[PDB]
């Protein structure tokens, strides 16, 4: 069983996210209390409601990343939702309860993908046992006789019920302030179509009756023009935890580039590997890069760490096309290279608005 205390949850999260420790800890407590509570009286086990977190911060910092990886970590079900959809100021429909009728699919279609290696080995030493096609098809076919009724559901739902995780996104977008984008409370309705979920209810779905009484909920939004206090009050109440994440520094970019145990630069590496080329990324390279990102962000529209991605892939454009060639060679990307493909571009700003 996963588990692991708050201290081990921040650890694990650092293998992926840079900075934003306040968030990792805060999301590491809400989490822990589950395992905590799960072990209590029949009473409290039905009284200590989950412990939701409301994240407040600029775009491109981790809000969404923390919880996506906090899911993988928990191995539990995850699902990200744009609160905005359920506002559809068009005049359509979007039964919020749906939010659950997925974190079931994703929590079920998962089970069938979590068990294709739960009895992989086993079903094969039999996919050769009934032969002494022989593994070609007969494996799946045998993977059809692998005791699958009842157990599925019970667990599936009880996987959601257990502790699926629903990360609402850009909630701030559904509050009402005063001037500008101040249409009408119809929006504040989407706020009211959620209470059920975030307050205890049952929803009927294909696989069975799921209850969001014990689901953890992580809402976000920058809250640029609206304080979390402008959210309907019932939500303010079901949102016990509040973390304000900070704006990432150039120093953070330099980090987000190389540190995380599955880094971006480290992906390019392996990627250009399959092409016999070997890349080295100088520190000053990794730096001028960051500066690149930071620059396009200050200069034009501020997207965040997200920026790394474009500007970066825009640097191996050359490398990857050729890559097939270069096999048996080790390309070296250092500062006066990063700048041989960046400066003149990150400087036009307008182009910066199209390809950067």
């Amino acid at each position: 069983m996963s588990e692991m205390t708050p201290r081990e949850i921040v650890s694990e999260l650092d293998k992926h996210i840079i900075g934003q420790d306040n968030a990792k800890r805060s999301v590491a407590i809400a989490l822990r209390n589950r395992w905590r509570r799960m072990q209590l009286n029949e009473e409290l086990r039905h009284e200590v409601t989950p412990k939701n977190i409301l994240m407040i911060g600029p775009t491109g910092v981790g809000k969404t990343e923390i919880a996506r990886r906090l899911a993988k970590l928990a191995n539990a079900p995850f699902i990200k939702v744009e609160a905005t959809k359920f506002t559809e100021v068009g005049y359509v429909g979007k039964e919020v309860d749906s939010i659950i009728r997925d974190l079931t699919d994703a929590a079920v279609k998962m089970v069938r993908v979590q068990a294709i290696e739960k009895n992989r080995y086993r079903a094969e030493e039999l996919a050769e046992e009934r032969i002494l096609d022989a593994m070609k098809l007969l494996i799946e076919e045998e993977a059809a006789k692998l005791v699958n009724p009842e157990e599925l559901k019970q667990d599936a739902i009880d996987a959601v019920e257990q502790h699926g995780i629903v990360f609402i996104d850009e909630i701030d977008k559904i509050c009402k302030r005063g001037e500008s984008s101040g249409p009408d409370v119809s929006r504040e309705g989407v706020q009211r179509d959620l209470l059920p979920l975030v307050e205890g209810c049952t929803v009927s779905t294909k696989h069975g009756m799921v209850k969001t009484d014990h689901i953890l909920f992580i809402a976000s939004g920058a809250f640029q023009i609206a304080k979390p206090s402008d959210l309907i009050p019932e939500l303010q109440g079901r949102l016990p935890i509040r973390v304000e994440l900070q704006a990432l520094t150039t120093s953070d970019f330099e980090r987000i580039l190389t540190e995380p145990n599955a880094s971006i630069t480290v992906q390019y590496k392996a990627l250009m590997a399959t092409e016999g080329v070997n890349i080295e990324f100088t520190d000053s390279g990794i730096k001028r890069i960051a500066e690149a990102a930071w620059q396009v962000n200050e200069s034009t529209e501020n997207i965040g760490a997200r920026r790394l991605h474009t500007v970066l892939e825009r640097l191996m454009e050359e490398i990857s096309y050729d890559a097939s060639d270069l096999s048996g060679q080790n390309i070296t990307i250092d500062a006066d290279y990063v700048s041989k493909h960046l400066d003149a571009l990150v400087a036009d700003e307008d182009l910066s608005r199209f390809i950067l």
Binding site: P58, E179, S180, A222, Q224, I225, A247
Partner: protein
């Protein structure tokens, strides 16, 4: 009424009178006609209705941090929200804001003018205040706060729509 600002040395200040006028008499003559979007820096003023004037006050307030301190990068996607946009037009005010970068002026219509030397002078007695403002900010070694406070006084002194209750913010950049 006279809002004044005089970027000088490592600082920029905005001063203002407090005379509210109903026809030919004066009500609240102690009007806090100047406040700052405490978001670190960004001092502004106001010339006209006390009512609305506030809206374009918090209006900025928010766009700032999202457009993060990048004042200029605000009036574009901010100030504009008056002319066109649907927020609210057909009003009258001049939030003369100022980061630690430059001092602008909006004639109300999402506009923006910038003093040949950043010396801002609006309000009834707006000209007078500037005539003194310029005169000192050119023949004395006086301060940004001083030349302003000294100017807002000459203004009030000669304009019957401006008094002497002052109000002024500042800083250091």
């Amino acid at each position: 009424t006279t809002i004044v600002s005089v970027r000088r040395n490592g600082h920029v200040v905005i001063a203002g009178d407090g005379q509210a006028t109903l026809g030919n008499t004066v009500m609240k003559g102690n009007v806090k006609k100047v406040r700052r979007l405490y978001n670190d820096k960004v001092i502004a003023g106001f010339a006209g209705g006390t009512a609305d004037a506030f809206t374009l006050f918090e209006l900025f307030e928010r766009k700032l941090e999202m457009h993060q301190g990048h004042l200029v990068k605000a009036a574009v996607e901010l100030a504009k929200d008056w002319r066109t946009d649907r927020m609210l037009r057909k009003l009258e005010a001049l939030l003369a804001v100022a980061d630690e970068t430059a001092s602008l002026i909006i004639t109300g219509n999402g506009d923006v003018v910038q003093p040949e030397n950043d010396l801002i002078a609006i309000g009834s007695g707006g000209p007078y205040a500037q005539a003194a403002a310029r005169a000192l900010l050119e023949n004395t070694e006086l301060s940004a706060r001083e030349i302003a406070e000294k100017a807002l006084d000459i203004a009030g002194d000669i304009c019957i729509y401006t008094n002497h209750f002052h109000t002024i913010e500042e800083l250091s950049y």
